[PDB]
Amino acid sequence: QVQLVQSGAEVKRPGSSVTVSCKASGGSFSTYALSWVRQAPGRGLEWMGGVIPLLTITNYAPRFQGRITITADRSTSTAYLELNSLRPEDTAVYYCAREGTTGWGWLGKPIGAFAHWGQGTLVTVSSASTKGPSVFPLAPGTAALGCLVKDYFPEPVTVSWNSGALTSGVHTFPAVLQSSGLYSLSSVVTVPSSSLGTQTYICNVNHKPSNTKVDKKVEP
Amino acid sequence: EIVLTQSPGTQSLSPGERATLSCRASQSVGNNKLAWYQQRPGQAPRLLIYGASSRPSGVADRFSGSGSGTDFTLTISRLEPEDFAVYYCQQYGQSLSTFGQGTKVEVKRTVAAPSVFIFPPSDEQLKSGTASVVCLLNNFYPREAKVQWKVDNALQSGNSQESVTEQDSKDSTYSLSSTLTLSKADYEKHKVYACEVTHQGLSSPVTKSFNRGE
């Protein structure tokens, strides 16, 4: 079986260059085409280019020609994407993808189409520094309550309620990027009004990069 | 460059319904080198069809591809719950490979008006010198909804951000949260904070509001 494992998320300053790696195991590394595909947040897939390692032949999309380099190292079965002169519009998840093969096994006739995908690498182009969030209550028929997780960097934060015991009616929204360059995220839950006096609601917020781990009791 | 057009960009369909997704190319795709991918939120794309009509082993045979030249179709014979996702076509008949913009197949359900809630800024946040006012639009369908902020009846622009959840896996609704942000000083200059909501399920706009400091 073919497995593609990419390097981890990285924050890059505007104007800098990023290198993303893709280590392959299984099948043949040198005789199958390896491509890079990116996806900006909330947008579609975009093919950037590829390499055939045995022949050291690259193929770049015109809109990246002059700004990217793709290379392959047969000794480690690793492929690399370099993207230069980074701008905010380059913030995206970058995927490596290898063409599939027909028949049994993974050494058959190549199919061109991308059967094997890496897990993706989030590249965030930003001038922001690591910062932990503040956690503010959204104080409460049906009642709504929640937590506002404001001003953190980088992604992600995770939120649970009552240590995971409460999931019904929970909505945790996608983060938004503020003009400051910091993220904000809201999580809400609806509960019976009658439960407000006789039940505690606690939002559990985790931001690993800042070691912010807060359990915020939300009351009327 | 071959431009691939996937129209409509969204299809609202019922569980168990047949789905047909179109991919039209600006010119003939060499050797039917056309593929289809599925992508669910937070996951890498997955190959469903290559060479216009070939299906890899392991891919469910309710997915079938057809077409040639410029006109291609992905057919899903009967939508399973896991089939609600985004589908992309891709051509690789030229050295410049391109993707369609994607079609989201989402769950059709009955109309549900948003339940609206407004939250003043916490005392804790106000101590820090900033005021975030939050408006929640909960459990509505279809996805199209609009929020406007009014402060002492003055329509606000440029000081709010919003986001929307993925379709709920249980009841197939959406929710939306919008946050109005002001400095403490500016927040304290005004009395009435209101969010005004419009939606297909509403015959007239719904306004939720509070008076600062009550």
Partner: peptide
């Protein structure tokens, strides 16, 4: 087509 190159590599490894 760059996409066709590995097919030929496969073919000439056979023969």
């Amino acid at each position: 087509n760059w996409f066709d190159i590995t097919n030929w590599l496969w073919y000439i490894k056979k023969k």
